[PDB]
Ligand binder design. Structure first.
Ligand SMILES: [Mg+2]
Lengths: 152, 152
């Protein structure tokens, strides 16, 4: 359908951006709203309401730029805002090997049904936070499967 | 002030803040503001954004060595329509020999539209404007802001 094709385009854009950032070890934090509304978190960031593209996602997260710290939040197949605040998890089961981006991703995942992707600035490793759990060191195939499961 | 007027003032302030940031850092930039002549044909050559204006987004677009930094940003009323757009190159004999492709592209679009284009030189950080085939160079921050206010 037109909307199934739009979803696949968004998945491709996300995975291309994530792959680029993983290769360069560019830290990134990208939350995808699901059924739990995240307007309160969107409002803490810089409003964009932009078309998704791999290029825009990459440009947002470039180190030492205005938009690179904080989360991108996507809603209805658009980038709602960048540089957003997310609540830090207080879970005692998050390794101290991991950074603030990962604790923020886990945190938002504890209070929403959203899917958050994280790229580590230390290793380029890619992880996903969902339902309070953090899935580490994801392959490209695994990330794609998660996104397809989430967008279905 | 009506909401439209306030929105316009916020857009002007966003533009001037971004231009000043890039000028100080010698970040080359090429920003065309649509006026009464429609620029859809040029917008369609770039990466669609259809995004809300912010100084932060304008800056992030033009960071050197990133996907979006080459080509023109085209704005519509209070929107960043697209980035990395093509513009026609002017053949004017009055374009200084010291100037690069960004300036020639700015003059070029200004010869076939009533748009206003702002250029930041990557060599000097100097700021210029192209309108109606004329290039005005080495603008102070006050001169640029007044030009934008006169343009709306
Ligand atoms: Mg370059």
């Amino acid at each position: 359908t037109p909307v199934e094709e739009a979803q696949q385009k968004t998945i491709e854009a996300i995975t291309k951006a994530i792959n680029y950032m993983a290769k360069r070890r560019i830290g990134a934090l990208l939350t995808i709203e699901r059924d739990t509304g995240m307007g309160d978190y969107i409002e803490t960031g810089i409003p964009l309401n932009a078309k998704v593209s791999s290029e825009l996602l990459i440009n947002i997260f470039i180190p030492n730029t205005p938009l690179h710290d904080g989360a991108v939040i996507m809603k209805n197949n658009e980038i709602a805002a960048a540089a957003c605040y997310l609540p830090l998890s207080e879970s005692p089961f998050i390794s101290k090997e991991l950074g603030t981006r990962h604790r923020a991703a886990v945190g938002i995942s504890e209070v929403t049904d959203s899917l958050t992707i994280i790229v580590s600035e230390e290793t380029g490793g890619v992880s996903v936070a969902k339902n309070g759990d953090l899935h580490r060191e994801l392959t490209e195939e695994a990330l794609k499967e998660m996104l397809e499961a989430e967008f279905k």
